Amino acid sequence: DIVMTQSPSSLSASIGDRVTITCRPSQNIRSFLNWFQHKPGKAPKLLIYAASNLQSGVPSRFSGSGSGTEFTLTIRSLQPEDFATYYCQQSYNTPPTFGQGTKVEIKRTVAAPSVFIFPPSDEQLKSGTASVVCLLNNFYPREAKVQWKVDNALQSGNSQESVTEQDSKDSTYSLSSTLTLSKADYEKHKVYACEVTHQGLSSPVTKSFNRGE
Amino acid sequence: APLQLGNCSVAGWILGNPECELLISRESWSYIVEKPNPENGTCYPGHFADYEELREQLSSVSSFERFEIFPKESSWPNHTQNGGSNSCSHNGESSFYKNLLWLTKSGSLYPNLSKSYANNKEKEVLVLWGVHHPPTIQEQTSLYVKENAYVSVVSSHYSRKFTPEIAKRPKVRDQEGRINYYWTLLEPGDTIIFEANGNLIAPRYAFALSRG
Amino acid sequence: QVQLEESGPGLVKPSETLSLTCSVSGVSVTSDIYYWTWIRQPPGKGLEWIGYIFYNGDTNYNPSLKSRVTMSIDTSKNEFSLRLTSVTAADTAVYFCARGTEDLGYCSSGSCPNHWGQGTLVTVSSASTKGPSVFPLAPSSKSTSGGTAALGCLVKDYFPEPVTVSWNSGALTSGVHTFPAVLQSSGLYSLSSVVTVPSSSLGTQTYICNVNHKPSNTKVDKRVEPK
Ligand SMILES: *[C@@H]1O[C@H](CO)[C@@H](O[C@@H]2O[C@H](CO)[C@@H](O)[C@H](O)[C@H]2NC(C)=O)[C@H](O)[C@H]1NC(C)=O
Ligand SMILES: *[C@@H]1O[C@H](CO)[C@@H](O)[C@H](O)[C@H]1NC(C)=O
């Protein structure tokens, strides 16, 4: 019933920047407020306990402040490993409640993707399905355009993309575009090309192969 | 007239947080002036039992007198006094609450203790004490020798046994251990009995008072 | 010091009961000071507290789910558990077990879990489990840069999530990217794991992907050979 409202819901900042996250409960909770950090695939970690108490092992660049109906988590010198979602949580009333979370992304310099293409494996073709995979490795910013070209014909509706979460060390992103075709449709064409457009590339980069070579 | 606590909470004042010392003496008051978020209170982290009731019972006082119920120089011949804590610092040095005494082992033993006080005054006496809960068995033994200790506080209208529970609490003021605080009002003619073989934060100063 | 591990991820049929267990190491679950808790995160949503349990009999569950929730402690196995009856798709979530230390001066009773497990994904479906088919993404000329080559494994057609992927049994970590799964038209999931390596290592160093699909008790290793 105590609604925990965080502001902002997401932010992007450079390495060394000072980052502040605000949490406001729907009523006065005194200092019964904690801050959690949650990295992808990892266990949520208690950073700040009872509004202001830093926990063991947490770097001193994290600090908590506030009381009553306004609370602030501060990261004074943002590091790449600080990419995470941060939650405030009130411990004043049952049930304990969390904020909606604040996703902290890292601003870094433009990085061009290295592109690679992978034709379907013979084992997969032995089952009647051909998956062609185009890979974009370690790029920034996240925005990228990947266009499939089959015999110099722009494809649509037969590809799916996946994007990694921001890397905790180099703050880049990586991406996969997978073209899925039946082995029949795949054999009626020869040239399979992946065209990549990105701010880090002066001109579009194309990786291609010829079926059967 | 209101009682001005400045930057201190009722807890910091009543327990004697070292930073709450310049508070001027008062024998009477009505209404306690406390900031919404006082900076100096329970410097050593812990649960202050029945605090809101205590705050209410001390809201209006007609007579107030602090005395050394258990004088430091003569009451504890068999035990040592801890060096206190950085969480309770005064003037850049580690200290502790003025009204309480952190008893520790003397040599290779923390001897059993039994201390009693009879309310010789014709007023009620506010007695306060604490029970320490170390974060680790190593700290329990280092301070009290025994791994399993007890604290007993009994009067004609009060009787409670406290068992230390060793565990790491979330860090508060760099402390994972805790000191739980307790209190009772000793009516005139009654006797309070303190018994322990470890973990007792003993009373040093009590308060004879008339409520209302 | 303390370690908590949730039971394996998997499926629960709708209207049936979800059962999860948390294995605890380092402390006793009979301890009076510690409380044991469960929390959940539905996909694309935040965190929801389910409740806590003390060995002393003290329990509290979220009113949002009280009627459906039952928690318990197993002293013989040093574990605690959660049971949730009449599940619906709304119960599809990552479930986290956790421990807290009673600290009444700074927290309501049982309300500050400070040591969490990594979580287990529960999917509510009437569908069956399907293990994955793993295929190689082999290093070739279409995968070099000069001093760097890319290889990987295509993990296709599985249900439900999740799948974990390792390389050379954990010896290979740097340069690995295991992508989030995509849901296909068929309703099954698929993903790829890749790694960038020195091309000088190609003909000498062995590369194998270890794909674990716990919901089907399936573990599969694929060697990626240059070609
Ligand atoms: C009493 O309150 C003051 C704050 O008004 C405390 O001083 C702070 O102490 C913390 C921890 O040592 C420091 O990180 C701050 O920088 C201090 N601020 C100032 C202005 O000194 C003081 O520690 C408190 N003392 C007790 C015993 O409660
Ligand atoms: C309270 O603390 C402030 C410093 O923040 C100080 O200026 C003031 O004198 C203190 N008040 C009392 C009553 O000591």
Side-chain angles (χ1 to χ4, degrees), chain C residues 155-185:
Chain C
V155 188
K156 190 163 158 62
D157 296 328
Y158 67 88
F159 187 89
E161 291 199 79
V163 152
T164 40
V165 180
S166 73
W167 284 93
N168 298 339
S169 302
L172 182 48
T173 50
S174 291
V176 173
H177 295 300
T178 300
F179 292 93
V182 296
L183 182 68
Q184 299 164 126
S185 73

Short mmCIF file of all heavy atoms in Angstrom, two decimals, chain C residues 155-185:
data_model
loop_
_atom_site.label_atom_id
_atom_site.label_comp_id
_atom_site.label_asym_id
_atom_site.label_seq_id
_atom_site.Cartn_x
_atom_site.Cartn_y
_atom_site.Cartn_z
N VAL C 155 21.64 -22.20 -30.09
CA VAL C 155 20.79 -23.02 -29.22
C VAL C 155 19.35 -22.81 -29.62
O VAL C 155 18.74 -21.81 -29.28
CB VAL C 155 21.04 -22.72 -27.74
CG1 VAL C 155 20.31 -23.70 -26.85
CG2 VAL C 155 22.53 -22.71 -27.45
N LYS C 156 18.78 -23.76 -30.31
CA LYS C 156 17.46 -23.55 -30.86
C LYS C 156 16.32 -24.44 -30.43
O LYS C 156 16.53 -25.57 -30.06
CB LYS C 156 17.56 -23.67 -32.39
CG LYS C 156 16.33 -23.25 -33.18
CD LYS C 156 16.70 -23.01 -34.63
CE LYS C 156 15.49 -23.13 -35.54
NZ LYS C 156 14.45 -22.12 -35.23
N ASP C 157 15.13 -23.90 -30.49
CA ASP C 157 13.92 -24.66 -30.21
C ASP C 157 13.76 -25.31 -28.82
O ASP C 157 13.68 -26.51 -28.71
CB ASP C 157 13.74 -25.67 -31.35
CG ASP C 157 13.52 -25.01 -32.68
OD1 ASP C 157 12.93 -23.92 -32.70
OD2 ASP C 157 13.95 -25.58 -33.70
N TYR C 158 13.71 -24.49 -27.79
CA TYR C 158 13.57 -25.00 -26.46
C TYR C 158 12.44 -24.32 -25.68
O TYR C 158 11.98 -23.26 -26.07
CB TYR C 158 14.89 -24.90 -25.70
CG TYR C 158 15.40 -23.52 -25.40
CD1 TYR C 158 15.03 -22.85 -24.25
CD2 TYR C 158 16.29 -22.89 -26.26
CE1 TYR C 158 15.51 -21.59 -23.97
CE2 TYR C 158 16.78 -21.63 -25.99
CZ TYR C 158 16.38 -20.99 -24.84
OH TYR C 158 16.86 -19.74 -24.57
N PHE C 159 11.98 -24.96 -24.62
CA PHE C 159 10.92 -24.43 -23.77
C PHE C 159 10.92 -25.23 -22.46
O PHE C 159 11.12 -26.42 -22.47
CB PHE C 159 9.55 -24.49 -24.44
CG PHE C 159 8.45 -23.81 -23.70
CD1 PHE C 159 8.19 -22.47 -23.89
CD2 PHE C 159 7.66 -24.52 -22.82
CE1 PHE C 159 7.17 -21.85 -23.22
CE2 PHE C 159 6.63 -23.90 -22.15
CZ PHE C 159 6.39 -22.56 -22.34
N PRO C 160 10.70 -24.56 -21.34
CA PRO C 160 10.71 -23.10 -21.31
C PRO C 160 12.08 -22.50 -21.10
O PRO C 160 13.06 -23.18 -21.18
CB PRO C 160 9.93 -22.81 -20.04
CG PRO C 160 10.34 -23.91 -19.13
CD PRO C 160 10.50 -25.13 -20.00
N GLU C 161 12.13 -21.20 -20.88
CA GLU C 161 13.37 -20.57 -20.50
C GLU C 161 13.65 -21.03 -19.05
O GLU C 161 12.75 -21.37 -18.33
CB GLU C 161 13.29 -19.06 -20.58
CG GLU C 161 13.17 -18.48 -21.97
CD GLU C 161 13.55 -17.02 -22.01
OE1 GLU C 161 14.76 -16.72 -22.03
OE2 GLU C 161 12.65 -16.16 -22.03
N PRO C 162 14.90 -21.05 -18.65
CA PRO C 162 16.08 -20.51 -19.29
C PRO C 162 17.13 -21.50 -19.75
O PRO C 162 17.05 -22.67 -19.46
CB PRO C 162 16.72 -19.73 -18.15
CG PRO C 162 16.39 -20.53 -16.93
CD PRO C 162 15.20 -21.40 -17.25
N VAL C 163 18.13 -20.99 -20.46
CA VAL C 163 19.25 -21.80 -20.86
C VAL C 163 20.51 -21.08 -20.47
O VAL C 163 20.63 -19.88 -20.63
CB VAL C 163 19.29 -22.08 -22.37
CG1 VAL C 163 20.72 -22.31 -22.84
CG2 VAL C 163 18.39 -23.25 -22.72
N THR C 164 21.43 -21.81 -19.90
CA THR C 164 22.71 -21.24 -19.55
C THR C 164 23.79 -21.83 -20.45
O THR C 164 23.71 -22.97 -20.85
CB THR C 164 23.03 -21.45 -18.06
OG1 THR C 164 22.63 -22.76 -17.66
CG2 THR C 164 22.29 -20.42 -17.22
N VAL C 165 24.76 -21.02 -20.81
CA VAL C 165 25.81 -21.45 -21.71
C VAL C 165 27.18 -21.11 -21.17
O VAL C 165 27.41 -20.02 -20.68
CB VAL C 165 25.62 -20.84 -23.11
CG1 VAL C 165 26.73 -21.31 -24.05
CG2 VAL C 165 24.25 -21.15 -23.67
N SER C 166 28.08 -22.05 -21.21
CA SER C 166 29.44 -21.83 -20.78
C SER C 166 30.36 -22.24 -21.90
O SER C 166 29.95 -22.92 -22.81
CB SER C 166 29.77 -22.63 -19.52
OG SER C 166 29.91 -24.01 -19.79
N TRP C 167 31.61 -21.82 -21.82
CA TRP C 167 32.59 -22.18 -22.82
C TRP C 167 33.82 -22.86 -22.17
O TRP C 167 34.34 -22.38 -21.18
CB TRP C 167 32.97 -20.96 -23.64
CG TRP C 167 31.95 -20.57 -24.64
CD1 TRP C 167 30.95 -19.67 -24.47
CD2 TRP C 167 31.82 -21.07 -25.97
NE1 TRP C 167 30.21 -19.57 -25.62
CE2 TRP C 167 30.72 -20.43 -26.55
CE3 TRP C 167 32.53 -22.01 -26.72
CZ2 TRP C 167 30.31 -20.68 -27.85
CZ3 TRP C 167 32.13 -22.26 -28.01
CH2 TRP C 167 31.03 -21.60 -28.56
N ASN C 168 34.23 -23.98 -22.73
CA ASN C 168 35.35 -24.75 -22.18
C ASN C 168 35.20 -24.93 -20.68
O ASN C 168 36.12 -24.67 -19.93
CB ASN C 168 36.68 -24.13 -22.59
CG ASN C 168 36.88 -24.13 -24.10
OD1 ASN C 168 36.27 -24.91 -24.82
ND2 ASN C 168 37.76 -23.27 -24.57
N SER C 169 34.00 -25.30 -20.25
CA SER C 169 33.72 -25.56 -18.85
C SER C 169 34.12 -24.43 -17.95
O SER C 169 34.56 -24.65 -16.84
CB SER C 169 34.37 -26.88 -18.43
OG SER C 169 33.88 -27.94 -19.23
N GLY C 170 33.93 -23.21 -18.41
CA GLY C 170 34.19 -22.06 -17.58
C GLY C 170 35.56 -21.46 -17.64
O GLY C 170 35.81 -20.45 -17.02
N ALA C 171 36.45 -22.07 -18.39
CA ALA C 171 37.80 -21.56 -18.53
C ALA C 171 37.81 -20.41 -19.50
O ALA C 171 38.68 -19.56 -19.43
CB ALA C 171 38.73 -22.64 -19.01
N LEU C 172 36.83 -20.39 -20.39
CA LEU C 172 36.72 -19.30 -21.35
C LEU C 172 35.62 -18.31 -20.99
O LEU C 172 34.45 -18.62 -21.10
CB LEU C 172 36.52 -19.85 -22.74
CG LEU C 172 36.45 -18.81 -23.87
CD1 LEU C 172 37.57 -17.79 -23.76
CD2 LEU C 172 36.43 -19.46 -25.23
N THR C 173 36.02 -17.12 -20.57
CA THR C 173 35.07 -16.11 -20.15
C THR C 173 35.16 -14.82 -20.94
O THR C 173 34.16 -14.24 -21.30
CB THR C 173 35.28 -15.79 -18.66
OG1 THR C 173 36.66 -15.52 -18.41
CG2 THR C 173 34.83 -16.96 -17.80
N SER C 174 36.38 -14.36 -21.19
CA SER C 174 36.58 -13.10 -21.89
C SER C 174 36.10 -13.13 -23.33
O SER C 174 36.37 -14.08 -24.05
CB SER C 174 38.05 -12.68 -21.81
OG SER C 174 38.41 -12.31 -20.49
N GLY C 175 35.37 -12.10 -23.74
CA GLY C 175 34.86 -12.04 -25.09
C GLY C 175 33.61 -12.83 -25.40
O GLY C 175 33.16 -12.86 -26.52
N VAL C 176 33.06 -13.49 -24.40
CA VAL C 176 31.85 -14.26 -24.58
C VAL C 176 30.57 -13.39 -24.52
O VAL C 176 30.42 -12.56 -23.65
CB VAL C 176 31.74 -15.43 -23.56
CG1 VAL C 176 30.38 -16.10 -23.66
CG2 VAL C 176 32.86 -16.43 -23.76
N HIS C 177 29.68 -13.59 -25.46
CA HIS C 177 28.41 -12.90 -25.42
C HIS C 177 27.32 -13.96 -25.59
O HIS C 177 27.25 -14.62 -26.60
CB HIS C 177 28.29 -11.82 -26.48
CG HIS C 177 29.24 -10.68 -26.32
ND1 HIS C 177 29.26 -9.88 -25.21
CD2 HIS C 177 30.15 -10.16 -27.17
CE1 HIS C 177 30.17 -8.93 -25.36
NE2 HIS C 177 30.72 -9.08 -26.55
N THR C 178 26.50 -14.12 -24.58
CA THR C 178 25.38 -15.04 -24.67
C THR C 178 24.12 -14.20 -24.74
O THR C 178 23.73 -13.59 -23.78
CB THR C 178 25.40 -16.11 -23.54
OG1 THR C 178 26.60 -16.88 -23.61
CG2 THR C 178 24.20 -17.03 -23.67
N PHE C 179 23.51 -14.15 -25.90
CA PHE C 179 22.36 -13.29 -26.12
C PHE C 179 21.06 -13.68 -25.44
O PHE C 179 20.80 -14.83 -25.21
CB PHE C 179 22.12 -13.18 -27.62
CG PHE C 179 23.19 -12.43 -28.36
CD1 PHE C 179 24.25 -13.10 -28.94
CD2 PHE C 179 23.13 -11.06 -28.49
CE1 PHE C 179 25.23 -12.42 -29.62
CE2 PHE C 179 24.10 -10.37 -29.17
CZ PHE C 179 25.16 -11.05 -29.74
N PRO C 180 20.26 -12.67 -25.11
CA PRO C 180 18.93 -12.98 -24.58
C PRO C 180 18.16 -13.76 -25.61
O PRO C 180 18.30 -13.54 -26.79
CB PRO C 180 18.31 -11.61 -24.41
CG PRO C 180 19.46 -10.69 -24.23
CD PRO C 180 20.55 -11.23 -25.09
N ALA C 181 17.35 -14.68 -25.14
CA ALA C 181 16.56 -15.48 -26.03
C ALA C 181 15.47 -14.73 -26.75
O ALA C 181 14.94 -13.76 -26.25
CB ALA C 181 15.95 -16.62 -25.27
N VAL C 182 15.17 -15.18 -27.94
CA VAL C 182 14.06 -14.62 -28.67
C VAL C 182 12.93 -15.67 -28.76
O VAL C 182 13.18 -16.86 -28.86
CB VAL C 182 14.47 -14.13 -30.07
CG1 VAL C 182 15.47 -12.99 -29.98
CG2 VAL C 182 14.99 -15.27 -30.93
N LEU C 183 11.70 -15.22 -28.66
CA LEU C 183 10.59 -16.13 -28.82
C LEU C 183 10.27 -16.26 -30.28
O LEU C 183 10.03 -15.28 -30.95
CB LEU C 183 9.37 -15.64 -28.06
CG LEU C 183 8.12 -16.52 -28.08
CD1 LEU C 183 8.37 -17.80 -27.31
CD2 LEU C 183 6.96 -15.76 -27.47
N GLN C 184 10.24 -17.48 -30.76
CA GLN C 184 9.91 -17.73 -32.15
C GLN C 184 8.41 -17.87 -32.42
O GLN C 184 7.63 -17.95 -31.50
CB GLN C 184 10.66 -18.97 -32.63
CG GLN C 184 12.17 -18.88 -32.57
CD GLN C 184 12.83 -20.23 -32.69
OE1 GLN C 184 13.69 -20.44 -33.54
NE2 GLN C 184 12.43 -21.16 -31.84
N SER C 185 8.03 -17.90 -33.68
CA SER C 185 6.62 -18.09 -34.07
C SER C 185 6.09 -19.37 -33.54
O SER C 185 4.93 -19.46 -33.19
CB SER C 185 6.46 -18.10 -35.59
OG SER C 185 6.94 -19.29 -36.16
#
